[PDB]
Design a protein around this nucleic acid. Sequence first.
RNA 1: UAUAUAUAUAUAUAUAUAUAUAUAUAUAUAUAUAUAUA
RNA 2: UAUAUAUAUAUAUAUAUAUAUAUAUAUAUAUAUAUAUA
Lengths: 1273, 143
Amino acid sequence: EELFNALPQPLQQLSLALAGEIPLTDHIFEQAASTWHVQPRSLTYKLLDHIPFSTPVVVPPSIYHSLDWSKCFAVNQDRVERVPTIDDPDDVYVPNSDIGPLLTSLHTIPDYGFLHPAIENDATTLRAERARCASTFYKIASSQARQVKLDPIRMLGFLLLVQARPRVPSGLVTDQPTRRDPTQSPALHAIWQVMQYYKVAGVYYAPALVVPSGAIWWIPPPGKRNVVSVQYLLTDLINLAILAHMTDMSPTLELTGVLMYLRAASSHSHAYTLLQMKSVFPALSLRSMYRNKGFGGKAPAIEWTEPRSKYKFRWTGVTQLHDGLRPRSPSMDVPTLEVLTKYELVDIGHIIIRERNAHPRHNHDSVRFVRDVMALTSGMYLVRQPTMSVLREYSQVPDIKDPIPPSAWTGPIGNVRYLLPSVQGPARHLYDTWRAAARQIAQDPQWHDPLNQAIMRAQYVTARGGSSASLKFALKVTGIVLPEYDDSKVKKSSKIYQAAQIARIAFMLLIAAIHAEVTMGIRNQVQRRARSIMPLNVIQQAISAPHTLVANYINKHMNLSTTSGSVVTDKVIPLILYASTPPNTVVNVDIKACDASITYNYFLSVICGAMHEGFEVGNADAAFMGVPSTIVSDRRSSVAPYSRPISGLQTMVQHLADLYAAGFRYSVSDAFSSGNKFSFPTSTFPSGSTATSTEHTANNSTMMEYFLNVHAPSHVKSASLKRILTDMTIQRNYVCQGDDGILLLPHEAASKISADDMNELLTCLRDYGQLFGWNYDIDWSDTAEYLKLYALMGCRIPNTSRHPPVGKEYAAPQTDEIWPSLIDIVIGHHLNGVTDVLNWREWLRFSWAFACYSSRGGYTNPKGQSFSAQYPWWTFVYLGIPPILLPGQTPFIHSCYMPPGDQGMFSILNGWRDWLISHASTTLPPLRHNHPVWGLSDVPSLLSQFGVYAGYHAAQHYRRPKPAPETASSDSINQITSDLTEYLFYDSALKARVMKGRYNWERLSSSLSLNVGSRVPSLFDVPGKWVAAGRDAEKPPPSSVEDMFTSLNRCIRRPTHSFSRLLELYLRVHVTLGESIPLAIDPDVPQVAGADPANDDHWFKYTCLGDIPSATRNYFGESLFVGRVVSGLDVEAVDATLLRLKILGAPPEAFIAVLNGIGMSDSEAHQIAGRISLANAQLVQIARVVHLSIPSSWMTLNTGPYIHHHAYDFKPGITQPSAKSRDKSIWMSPILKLLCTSYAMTVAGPVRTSIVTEIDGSAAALSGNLRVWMRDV
Amino acid sequence: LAPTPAGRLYKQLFGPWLMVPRLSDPLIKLRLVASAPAKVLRAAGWTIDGDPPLEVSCLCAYVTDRAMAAALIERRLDSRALVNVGGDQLMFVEYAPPLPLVSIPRTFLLPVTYVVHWVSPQRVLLNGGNVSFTSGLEWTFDD
RNA sequence: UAUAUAUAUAUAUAUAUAUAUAUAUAUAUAUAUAUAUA
RNA sequence: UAUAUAUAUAUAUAUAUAUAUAUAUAUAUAUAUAUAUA
């Protein structure tokens, strides 16, 4: 491969290491990283010359047809709009224009350019129209290019490097070498052809270059001109090329994707063109697979347990597939082909359909094909001008087909109107439901509990926030002089900052401020319009409390919130799998825009009236959250009007209804556009975070229930449909979360419902939603779409396109981040490639290349010095990336499921133990006195020679700079503290409780001499945590950066030869692997697409353990003792301390002090303390006391039973008696089991039984040291 | 929703004016003119005499005690104005922080409606293209 | 001039039957290559 | 040379899918004729 010869020497070495030829070393690790940072990026394109492509792809010159930008922008009413070219009002995206004329030249790199300083000045100072339009166009065009985790060229360099040389085979019988090869990929050939336009003297000038402040462009010569779309096309091509290789797809499918992108790029508005024909691929493949005759195969047999509210499922065998079970819904070929005819891409459909017809039976190949084809959709984070986005989304109002007549209301109650009893229909149903819930909320001593009140107030504060300026204005307007703490370096717009200002003020004085402006933000998306973030101010968030509370009660006490408890997201996995099984018919539904359709004229007025009436049952004089009862005029009786008191809850409703009727008033201040901030109101619900899911899920459930039980039976025609539609209820037939929803039909007896009845049913539902202005957007394709998860016949399909390898969202014109953060990006990037099942061997190779580039970085003072550093590669091992090849071992023996942290280290060393010991003896002189785990052979020196300690400690170092304090600012720190504590401790009982607990605790901890300095979670530190978070949200000063680099280097250079005490002790255990465990399911049945004999290790791991989490006796430790806690503190810290105390045998008052330290009253403290026992605790619950946790990668596997009865901590016939844990086994055995299973999961291949065989020291010695360490911390 | 008596709004608007004839001493006019640099005007093709920045009356007010009125005129309103005007001299104003009525000292008096206009139309000699600019607000006397 | 109904012709779509072509799967025969045995 | 296994090609048979042609039925559009109304 001449390309391998083209690489420079260090990169050739790195490629050899990645191929598994040689063990990786820090030396070559640096040489590769360094040289990448010094050579120009264009050379990566230069590498493409040495690929003899043989693919049938032609790049039409139609691409280079820049449409003039001047006609794509205009300003009216002093705002820069997009003025769409086509008559479609949605063409509001970046056009296809030549950016060239707007460029100057840089002094550093003369070839590339940036915006004219003249243009931006005139747009800023003169507000000149054309200047502003040019600026806006330049800003957004640059931003669209910036939507990548790093420069795409670097990723392309990674792909070439790994693909430059075939990987060496391992000894495994399932290690199939790659079937795909270069010179056959249409993507790379396409990149070659298109890039031929950008060379002048064989130099291959990149069309653009991304920088921290955005992206720069190259000035074209007089002959040529660069269209911004080309850059986007390159990114899509590179992303597709990487994905195709990792997914190992046929070149034909990649060919179709290339043609797909080219056609989109040829026309104007590359983004808009792609967006229009988005769903073509899933419709062609996923929605229509088995609509033929030769159907068959094996399918999972999943059963839903009787208490369906618990969402518990059981795998109970397999089911043979046959024609009677084949999908009933019509295919999707006709509409898709009709759409494709518009863009004359019918060939793509013909190719896809013909290829699809080669999979008549459901098996691994079929789903693998589906996974690959669905991976063809564009992975670009689309971005448009926020001004257009806000103008296009919130300009919608629902259309009600039968409005509530005005005569249907009673007389006013000051603001609200009650609903007349004579009114029926869905509105009546909605009214009663909310009213009933309001009644239940009304009398509930759960509130007025001071602890619960603390939870609600604390829930309102986060590091982020907004609308602070509106807050300061509104209160200053009403004569309220708020405090300030600027010297305490914390952002004013933080929700924390405004909360501190409010602490002292009597609440009712603030009531006028709730009718104030709210700022807004935008977050871009991959396959849809960008999302919206609308953070209310703290006061508004407080007022809306009743709305949330009632919604919560509706959810938690009707359909159990339809999984909106979100305890572990994986509970939806078995649900959709069950929903997609052949015996069941499922329908996917979701509100078209629930945020935009909920409104006051129809919905909120009804809810407000119901809540206000529902609160009538209760003491009319009972203040709630500092809101006192007031007098309101009642005008229900025209003959006898009067005024009566109303409780604080009702007063809240009175104002809340007023606000909703007035409509939200937003203020847009987009930065990408130029000087165009303004404010306009809308009825669109905020819906900026999970706090909105409760309301929409409640209304979603309510309307669905009424439709099923009342509207549909009264209106449908088919008698058979009526027969099956009856005996159906939401609690066992429907789930939802926000707009999203799933509806599944009762099992038709050995049969399926007529599509005719389905059409009748679906039609009526659409009309039902049309009544009150909900577009239901339903579909029926015998698949499962819920929370962006896809299941087909009980097999999960990872939609990889939603996690593009290169793409990353950036919501601001500047990246605003520092170099070390890139490491965390790499770690998160790699995990997705594990969550989604890719070719695990090749994905690992690519990951290391990414890591190598990220391993190095530098910084420069605003005026002064530069700084630099880089990590030894062992860091990434500690961070959770398996090594490819260790010295003395064979490559590719470590599975991706290897746990991060100490566990991964221990497992690696445990396997590597014997070779290290023997090799150290030959190579080095013995150490001077005996070692606990090692002999005299002195492996630690060898590890230092490998730089293991350097990497091990380097990964421990922090990666974000720290802000500095000040003393007059500390007066503000105290002022900030005092007020935060004041806001937290509204009453006095909590303060007395915490103070008593803290005083007793330190007294006990010192006098009993457990230890001193134990940072125990307590409420007094919660404000401190808030303050630190608030100060951290600020951009750090350069001095902090310099401290980081210096500290990091010193930590790297310091010669240390010891791990943490825990890892040192963990090495004392010897673990061995026996035979394979009995299988969970039939290996024939596919469960996750791509986890097949080709991708062996995933296929092994899933097959052995089974995917369905089925903790019938374990419950994965979710039964934490402290169900109710305040924000800021960590439950996982609290229970760990409690168990640690219990193991240490502390006296009960120690528990009492600790519990009282977090607000628990003495009585409940005793009650809680009594529950603490080593028996009822779960394996993971107790094992976490020493930070032994379950890796996130395991959350999709049924590891419970294995850990329970497959990891033998003491097998009688194998273990040495020295390792017998004896009585301490009650808390020793879980630790050993966790270590054992971690090692077993580390190695590749099938899961084997794990057995402790020996502890070098006695088990007693191990337990004693552990108790010491537990007492120390 | 519960509607309010329209008379209250009428009282808020016209009420104060109805008390004018009961007064014993004459009124004093005021305004909060906002400046306009001549650079942008000329840059927009406008023909204007004199260097001093142009200014435009946003809203006129009335008082009667010159002493306290002057004593209250030193406050700097924290509300910018986003002035916009077309070539047809259709002039528009916008306050980036909304101007609340309660912020007005209760000794003042406002007209029910008002139209923004140049304080001195003779300064301009030719309307160029449409113009927009931002400026601060400052209560000032007038004669 | 227009609307409605009926008949006839032509075009397009859907269903069924027959013929031809192409693709895929399975079986059998023949040829060629590679491996193993004699 | 023969046997056995694997791969590829060609031929024949059977099944499935798609396309094209012809026939029949149904729907829609257009034209022409006839009737009725304006």
